[PDB]
Design a protein around this ligand. Structure first.
Ligand SMILES: Nc1ncnc2c1ncn2[C@@H]1O[C@H](COP(=O)(O)OP(=O)(O)O)[C@@H](O)[C@H]1O
Ligand SMILES: Nc1ncnc2c1ncn2[C@@H]1O[C@H](COP(=O)(O)OP(=O)(O)O)[C@@H](O)[C@H]1O
Ligand SMILES: [Cl-]
Ligand SMILES: [Cl-]
Ligand code: NA
Ligand code: NA
Ligand code: NA
Ligand code: NA
Lengths: 249, 249
């Protein structure tokens, strides 16, 4: 029902998205502005856009800079930061800013900005090749999951750029995989129980804790064609997400 | 106005708390149950208790086990997890569960449980001595900050145990320092602007990004007696938090 639009200027990110994502989803290789421009030929809708930002709400670089220029510049940023409460927001959290209040600076059909802090500050990248899981796969999954979970149920579409693939420094090959997995779970809709999706996330992130894998979910894996053994040994570095969520689902 | 009660069975944690925290704050060395017992001699109040849990809401170990036994066991946990929405909650987020709904399992004077995921699952510790900042100081600060920020404004007191100092594996010496810093900011009340507190957090976490340090905050540092140079080189491993928030404030 909700159209997901992945947008990025980096070809590496868009190509990987195409290669890993099975209408309800669109991929735009280019600037946010070019997407918004062509977004006026089909309408003659309400959207939310994901902001991979910092813990303080400043919109001075990367994707956020696009938003900065598009919505009003400095005065907008000042307004934006105050909507966020003006204080430190932790990475792993998400806050929705409703632009509807633009009626005392409105723009296009975007009513919401889903602010997801991906870095405390852009003083350095978050990624460390020594642990691509803790500084790559996990943080990216968390940002995508939070973006999807916080998306207002009333919007027509959701605009999302590569997460942590810019100033955060996470390789596209890692980020795109976590983004794809989060999307695949979302796309599965109610075809997979909330609890089983929990388990898939737990093993995808490599936290094999049996106590959190109920028998009912094992029964569900059997019914859905999800190999429990491959699940229990899932290696995000080498295994295809198709093993956790078979395309048939 | 709000009484903060730090509670833990580990003497190392309580001693460090005493040594690092300047009535409005109480420290209980012992089990949560012993605290709740003695919490009946002064009343003849509404509280919130912080749960350093997992991303799935299970209450099977550590402090959470105390809550599990105290509030009703398995049936309570089942109810609790559903109040949390029944799905994966990211580390770096916090969700408040209102026990008031216990009137169709109520207990003492605790009305809220502030659930703060400190681990995805207790399959292993989050701490890594190779980077005590990314896996220790930062996650602990984030949990304390989220606990304080999400504490309902209507409660009389807030019960908080050591964060990430159990199954998470963070050394008490690291966790207690981040807990103390978060408390010191909270205790400073309006004596320090929201923006300056942001900057102190930014440097405490070691993200020296000048663009996020406004001139107005520098002026404030000067007025408050906060050495801007020591601030800009703050080393959470060696520097005292008293340098960021002078006790005079
Ligand atoms: N104007 C833009 N339009 C579309 N995509 C952009 C634009 N600017 C940056 N991006 C892309 O957005 C992604 C994330 O960027 P960034 O803002 O730096 O966030 P993060 O700090 O999480 O990495 C990158 O893949 C980058 O190529
Ligand atoms: N019953 C209890 N009463 C008071 N403190 C407790 C109790 N059980 C555990 N703790 C303390 O709570 C802290 C955090 O415990 P834990 O639940 O394992 O969370 P985390 O996974 O974040 O480390 C530890 O310092 C531990 O000693
Ligand atoms: Cl743009
Ligand atoms: Cl106890
Ligand atoms: Na960012
Ligand atoms: Na950005
Ligand atoms: Na925990
Ligand atoms: Na616990």
């Amino acid at each position: 029902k909700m159209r997901i639009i992945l947008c990025d200027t980096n070809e590496v990110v868009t190509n990987l998205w195409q290669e890993s994502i099975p209408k309800y989803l669109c991929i735009h290789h280019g600037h946010l502005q070019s997407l918004m421009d062509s977004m006026r030929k089909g309408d003659a809708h309400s959207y939310a856009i994901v902001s991979p930002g910092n813990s303080y709400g400043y919109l001075g670089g990367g994707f956020d800079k696009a938003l900065y220029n598009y919505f009003g510049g400095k005065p907008f940023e000042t307004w934006f930061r105050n909507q966020l409460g003006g204080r430190y927001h932790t990475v792993g959290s998400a806050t929705v800013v409703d632009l509807q209040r633009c009626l005392e600076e409105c723009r296009d059909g975007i009513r919401y900005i889903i602010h997801v802090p991906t870095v405390v500050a852009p003083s350095a990248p978050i990624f460390n090749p020594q642990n691509p899981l803790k500084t790559g796969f996990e943080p990216v999954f968390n940002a995508m999951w939070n973006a999807l979970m916080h998306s207002p149920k009333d919007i027509d579409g959701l605009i999302i750029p590569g997460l942590c693939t810019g100033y955060a420094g996470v390789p596209p090959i890692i980020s795109c995989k976590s983004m794809a997995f989060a999307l695949r779970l979302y796309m599965a809709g109610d075809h997979i129980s909330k609890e089983l999706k929990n388990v898939l996330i737990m093993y995808y992130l490599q936290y094999p804790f049996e106590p959190f894998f109920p028998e009912s979910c094992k029964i569900e894996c059997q019914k859905l064609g999800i190999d429990i053994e491959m699940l229990k040994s899932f290696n995000v570095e080498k295994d295809a997400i198709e093993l956790l969520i078979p395309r048939r689902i």
